[PDB]
Amino acid sequence: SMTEYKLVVVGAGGVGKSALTIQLIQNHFVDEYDPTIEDSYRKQVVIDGETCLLDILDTAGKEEYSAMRDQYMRTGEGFLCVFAINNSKSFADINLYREQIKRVKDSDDVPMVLVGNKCDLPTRTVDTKQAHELAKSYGIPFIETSAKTRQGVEDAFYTLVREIRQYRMK
């Protein structure tokens, strides 16, 4: 009976989609690399005082399987689009995910949050000023995270929930 939200985590391989999701679900940081096939998790939380049920789909970052993303994009209600701050290609790839979501869902305003992960790292290659500008061009929030330290993890997921809530109140 509690309100449900279908969240989907997308982005290039190795950016930390699973590390972010596992932090939220299991409260630990996966150091090893275990590339994902597809995983689903459920968790109840309280956001701004309202209880809700998150269904989270953690997807593979495998560009050769881009055609397989359509089906989960149709089902998903909101998308965390994740890049890593030490992977410039992953930031370039964001545009492709955003355009695929817009095309597959035939919708100009799908709930989305842009996530820049690995902000604990001692060096980087992505200029986060460009991330702010990209998020503005899409009309969506930009959130910096580190799955390693847990910084911003709850904020990224809860912000996406708020975007879905606003969409439903349009």
């Binding site: 096939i37 995983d39 050769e64």
Partner: protein, 164 residues
């Protein structure tokens, strides 16, 4: 001449059947030798007792992680990793035996057995063998898999070795 090796597959400890493989040493000698030696255990480690951690019906059965038993480990007889030997052989249909990897030149011990043609894996995974006897056993293994590969019973290599 090409060696033949076998696995005796078990389901929660109960025997299921034997699968045998021809290893194409005439085309990928280094990759075939790794799998042969890991099947006999002659270096002091290998496939005996390890599990098939990922079974996806319609595609393949993947195994070979005898070091971590979590789908992330494994090692070769040459060290931690070795190069992609060549891509002469292709993923042409059911029964193909090919190396799993984490990108170019990262072969260790993990492998997969195709249950269908997987031609999009050509040029990314080194094919080095093919099921001889017991394809029906590989087919039977699919009932223990799932869409993301998680298995519903423990599917193990209870015994393994060389026949030819």
């Amino acid at each position: 001449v090409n060696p033949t090796v076998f696995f005796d597959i078990a389901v929660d400890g109960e025997p299921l059947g034997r699968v045998s493989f021809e290893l194409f040493a005439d085309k990928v000698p280094k990759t075939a030798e790794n799998f042969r030696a890991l099947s006999t255990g002659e270096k002091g480690f290998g496939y005996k007792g390890s599990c098939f951690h990922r079974i996806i019906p319609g595609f393949m059965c993947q195994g070979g992680d005898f070091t971590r038993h979590n789908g992330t480990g494994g090692k070769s007889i040459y060290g931690e990793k070795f190069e992609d030997e060549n891509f002469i052989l292709k993923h042409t249909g059911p029964g193909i035996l090919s190396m799993a990897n984490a990108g170019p030149n990262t072969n260790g011990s993990q492998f997969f057995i195709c249950t269908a043609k997987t031609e999009w894996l050509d040029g990314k995974h080194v094919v080095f063998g093919k099921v001889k006897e017991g394809m029906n056993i590989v087919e039977a293994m699919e009932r223990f898999g799932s869409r993301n590969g998680k298995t519903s019973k423990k599917i193990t290599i209870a015994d393994c070795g060389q026949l030819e």
